[PDB]
Amino acid sequence: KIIINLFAPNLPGSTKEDDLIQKSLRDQLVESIRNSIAYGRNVFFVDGTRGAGKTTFINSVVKSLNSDQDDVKVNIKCLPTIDPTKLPRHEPILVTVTARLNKMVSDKLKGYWASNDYRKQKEQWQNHLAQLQRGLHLLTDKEYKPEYFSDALKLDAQLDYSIGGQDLSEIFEELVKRACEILDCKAILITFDDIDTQFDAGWDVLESIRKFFNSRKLVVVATGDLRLYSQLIRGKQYENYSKTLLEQEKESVRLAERGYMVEHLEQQYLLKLFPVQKRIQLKTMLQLVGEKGKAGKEEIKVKTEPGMQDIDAIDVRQAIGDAVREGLNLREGSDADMYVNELLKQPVRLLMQVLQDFYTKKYHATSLSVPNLLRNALYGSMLSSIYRAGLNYEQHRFGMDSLCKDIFTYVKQDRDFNTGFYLRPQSESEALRNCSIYLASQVSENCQGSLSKFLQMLLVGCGSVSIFNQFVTELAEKFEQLISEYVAYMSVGRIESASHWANRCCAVVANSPNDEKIGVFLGMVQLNRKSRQHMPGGYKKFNIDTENGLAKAAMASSLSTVASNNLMDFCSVFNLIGAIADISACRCERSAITNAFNKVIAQTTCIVPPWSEATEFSDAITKVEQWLKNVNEIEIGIRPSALLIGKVWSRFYFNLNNVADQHKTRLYRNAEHGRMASQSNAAKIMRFNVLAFLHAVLVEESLYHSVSDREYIGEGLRLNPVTSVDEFEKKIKIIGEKLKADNKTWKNTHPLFFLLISCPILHPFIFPVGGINCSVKALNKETSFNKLIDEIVGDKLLSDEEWDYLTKNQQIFQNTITSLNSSTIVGASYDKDTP
């Protein structure tokens, strides 16, 4: 039963019983210490990294040994713990030990009453101390005076030392023996604190232990890190090599053999001092409480509130679980517990300061933004790792712009361009591992409570590194110059708008001239700006004026042109998504919504990246204004994570790869008004580009969104819709009834998909006139698809007569695209027809 009170100071000095994390080792060491005496140098080493609690451990060992020392068969007196870092820089350790030993002895003489025995054993003690003072210069001398030879040849004493000469260890050995007689103890414990704070001063501890602490009446307990003593020992065996030899034999053959010798003298210097059978490894908090399935060797509980009852105290893994899950907006499972495990493997001081800072402000805040509490808690603890890894550190500049830059500068060092945006604690280095949980808190804090910041992190944050894992990585110091150019061109960290990112993102996927020269790309299709001959069928140069209402608005938000030797023109889904990320940010006023469609269309000049060789429109605004009304009351309960945004991009990116190549072929002569799956056109590619985003959001919303604990897709193969709709239709059908079963609505369980499926900007792209897979029986799926969508959003996207025109083989369309199918894709050969 171990309970840690977070509102207590929780310091190594101010830690009483009943909260010792190391209670199994404290008892195990003490009995093993007593066993050694009850049965030669006797040194116990308590291993452990920095912040493990080594000072707190020995502090408990002395407390558990000084109690009932005379009430047990083997009496062991303990000196106060010696801290090698806090001692005077030049004070010998033997001086410190003797000074602390003299105080213990003198205090015992003042407890005696028989003056005959008091005076008999005080003359001996003063004689031994005076003899130690006489020979103390042997340590603090830079030369050997010839007149000291008389001291070695003096025998004017009754000691009758075994070996001749003024051996200081011999003088100290009987000094300890005299002290044991006075204190009436069978041994004396010399506890040495760790040297981790300043480890160059721990050499005197090592040399003193092996020289003067060899007696059977001395028990030495020294803690620290063997990884740190090894560097101290190795650097001192190198000082035994003459400087001239090192300078004259700098070549590898003899240099390597010397290094083999030093590591082979270091190895046995540790084995001589701290024997393996006596070392004790301090267990980190993960090894105590254990995992969910593995039995917890101990039971650690945390008092997360002031005045909390002992029964009320909650388990530490649950306490970390609450902070990690709510702080990162993350749901119970492998991903949430992967962060919790990493926080447990942290040094105890670092972990106990994350919890202390998080739960102190959490309680104080109520007297909420839990992700903000964890962001500040992790910022302070992982600050040394943030500085090392080069992440943003100023707190007045925290925001979306200063976060997407951090995600790019993190995966660049992590080298995980495929899954780095997940921000999982997987990096081998501890600095990048520490930043991963801090960055995850940053993403779960900024994007929380707003849909606009979710899409900016999706495109600018997660996307920018994927648009680097391809289309920029083939060009690769040159790599650091490529990074410098790429982030300056795309202006990540200072983006003007999400749409502005998409237009630059259009060029990089365009300034990489793909094979077959077809102007069909990942999530973007090129369209001709000029008219020529040789165009069969109804294919024609794209004209924006053909579309009406939302149809004109939807393309205007999607069209993006880049200035080059010739003005390329593109229709991307990133521009469509970036437009949504811009409308959501602004207010519900009509004036601001109008500018969103008109931020890029006719006032931007997207020069190619340097790494290249060369009214009814008011009705459209009304629908967007109505949708923005929904966003401002639904997005307040959104809980996006760094995992969800990373996952949603991953599926959305994978689909855009499938639809890119699976439609690079089906661009045949009769593809206009495509009705079979073997014919595709600009209305087909863009329909599944948009439907890819609506699916990636849909499938991994229920999978990973923290608002709904349960899973509503159920168990099955989560195939994604490419050139088809049944894959999307299968999942959207089966989700609907489960919420009715659980008495939950579509908006309070999948707020992200509900908002994006009800966005009028992408509504014309869901059912383009050109893009409809009205097969003999697949049209029933789309008929169900339209019915499901019309019920999710609450409004009929297309009227009964409007739907019949798309399926059955004039009409004006104010809600669906019209001229996209007739558009001519650059680099497409319109000579081969569908067979």
Ligand X SMILES: Nc1ncnc2c1ncn2[C@@H]1O[C@H](COP(=O)(O)OP(=O)(O)OP(=O)(O)O)[C@@H](O)[C@H]1O
Chain residues binding ligand X by CB under 6 A are 4, 10-12, 15, 19-21, 50-56, 193-194, 196-197, 268, 272, 348-349, 352
Contact code string over 367-386 relative to a second copy, x by CB under 8 A: ---------xx--xx-xxxx
Tell me the site size for a second copy, rule CB under 8 A: 161
Choices 3-11, 175-183, 661-669, 749-757; region in contact with a second copy by CB under 8 A:
3-11
CB of 127 to ligand X, least distance (A): 32
CB of 325 to a second copy, least distance (A): 16
**Contact call for residues 342 and 284 (beta carbons, < 8 A):** no
CB of 191 to ligand X, least distance (A): 12
For residue 193, the partner it binds in a second copy, ligand X, none, with Cβ less than 5 to 8 A by kind, is ligand X
CB of 92 to a second copy, least distance (A): 6
Instruction: Please list the residues that pair with 43 across neighbouring strands.
Output: 220
Does position 99 interact with a second copy (CB under 8 A)? The reply is: yes
Considering only 30, 62, 74, 138, the residue that binds a second copy (CB under 8 A) is 138
CB of 721 to a second copy, least distance (A): 36
**Contact call for residues 37 and 74 (beta carbons, < 8 A):** yes
Does position 275 interact with a second copy (CB under 8 A)? The reply is: yes
Does position 180 interact with a second copy (CB under 8 A)? The reply is: no
CB of 217 to ligand X, least distance (A): 19
Does position 334 interact with a second copy (CB under 8 A)? The reply is: yes
Does position 247 interact with a second copy (CB under 8 A)? The reply is: yes
Does position 210 interact with a second copy (CB under 8 A)? The reply is: yes
For residue 541, the partner it binds in a second copy, ligand X, none, with Cβ less than 5 to 8 A by kind, is none
CB of 233 to ligand X, least distance (A): 13
In whole angstroms, what is the distance from residue 443 CA to residue 38 CA?
59
Tell me the CA distances in angstroms from 757 to 126, 459, 593, 781, 789, one per residue in order: 91, 18, 19, 18, 8
Closer to a second copy by Cβ: residue 538 or 610: 610
CB of 195 to ligand X, least distance (A): 9
Q: What is the DSSP letter of 461?
A: I
Considering only 50, 122, 529, 733, the residue that binds a second copy (CB under 8 A) is 50
Place of tokens 């603090």: 140
For residue 380, the partner it binds in a second copy, ligand X, none, with Cβ less than 5 to 8 A by kind, is a second copy
In whole angstroms, what is the distance from residue 705 CA to residue 714 CA?
15
What is residue 791's three-state secondary structure? helix
**Contact call for residues 795 and 763 (beta carbons, < 8 A):** no
Closer to a second copy by Cβ: residue 356 or 773: 356
In whole angstroms, what is the distance from residue 296 CA to residue 288 CA?
6
Closer to a second copy by Cβ: residue 253 or 741: 253
Please give the full DSSP string across 403-456, using - where no structure is assigned: HHHHHHHHHHHH--TTTGGG--TT-SSHHHHHHHHHHHHHHHHHSTT-HHHHHH
Closer to ligand X by Cβ: residue 21 or 772: 21
Length of the chain: 835
Helix, strand, coil shares, percent, the chain, to 5: 55, 5, 40
Q: Which of residues 288-327 bind a second copy (CB under 8 A)?
A: none
Q: Which of residues 58-87 bind a second copy (CB under 8 A)?
A: 80, 86
Does position 198 interact with a second copy (CB under 8 A)? The reply is: yes
Q: Which of residues 494-513 bind a second copy (CB under 8 A)?
A: 494, 496
Considering only 23, 63, 177, 258, the residue that binds a second copy (CB under 8 A) is 258
For residue 200, the partner it binds in a second copy, ligand X, none, with Cβ less than 5 to 8 A by kind, is a second copy
Considering only 67, 73, 114, 146, the residue that binds a second copy (CB under 8 A) is 146
Considering only 17, 117, 184, 267, the residue that binds a second copy (CB under 8 A) is 267
Q: Which of residues 737-796 bind a second copy (CB under 8 A)?
A: none
Considering only 72, 261, 544, 567, the residue that binds a second copy (CB under 8 A) is 261
Considering only 117, 123, 200, 737, the residue that binds a second copy (CB under 8 A) is 200
CB of 210 to ligand X, least distance (A): 9
CB of 639 to a second copy, least distance (A): 18
46-49-54 Cα angle (round to 5): 45
In whole angstroms, what is the distance from residue 51 CA to residue 224 CA?
10
For residue 19, the partner it binds in a second copy, ligand X, none, with Cβ less than 5 to 8 A by kind, is ligand X
Q: Specify the pairing of strand 2-5 against strand 43-47.
A: unpaired
Closer to a second copy by Cβ: residue 136 or 719: 136
In whole angstroms, what is the distance from residue 225 CA to residue 462 CA?
39
Considering only 16, 88, 111, 311, the residue that binds a second copy (CB under 8 A) is 88
**Contact call for residues 550 and 623 (beta carbons, < 8 A):** yes
Considering only 68, 113, 295, 396, the residue that binds a second copy (CB under 8 A) is 396
Place of tokens 């939807």: 554
Closer to ligand X by Cβ: residue 106 or 287: 287
For residue 385, the partner it binds in a second copy, ligand X, none, with Cβ less than 5 to 8 A by kind, is a second copy
In whole angstroms, what is the distance from residue 773 CA to residue 684 CA?
9
Q: Which of residues 570-599 bind a second copy (CB under 8 A)?
A: 586, 592
In whole angstroms, what is the distance from residue 699 CA to residue 304 CA?
36
Closer to ligand X by Cβ: residue 20 or 171: 20
Tell me the CA distances in angstroms from 87 to 55, 81, 82, 198, 370, one per residue in order: 16, 12, 8, 11, 44
**Contact call for residues 598 and 630 (beta carbons, < 8 A):** no
Tell me the CA distances in angstroms from 221 to 84, 224, 581, one per residue in order: 13, 10, 62
Does position 406 interact with a second copy (CB under 8 A)? The reply is: no
Please give the full DSSP string across 200-261, using - where no structure is assigned: GGGHHHHHHHHHH--STTEEEEEEE-HHHHHHHHHHHHGGGS-HHHHHHT-SHHHHHHHHHH
Closer to a second copy by Cβ: residue 350 or 707: 350
Considering only 430, 569, 625, 711, the residue that binds a second copy (CB under 8 A) is 430
Tell me the CA distances in angstroms from 52 to 47, 278, 383, 656, 819, one per residue in order: 9, 19, 19, 48, 68
Does position 603 interact with a second copy (CB under 8 A)? The reply is: no
Closer to ligand X by Cβ: residue 348 or 577: 348
**Contact call for residues 748 and 739 (beta carbons, < 8 A):** no
Does position 428 interact with a second copy (CB under 8 A)? The reply is: yes
**Extended strands (E) in 284-407:** 300-303, 314-315
CB of 497 to a second copy, least distance (A): 10
Q: Which of residues 515-554 bind a second copy (CB under 8 A)?
A: none
Closer to a second copy by Cβ: residue 296 or 380: 380
**Extended strands (E) in 477-617:** 524-526, 559-563, 568-572, 606-607
The sign of the dihedral angle between the CA atoms of 818, 820, 824, 828 is: negative
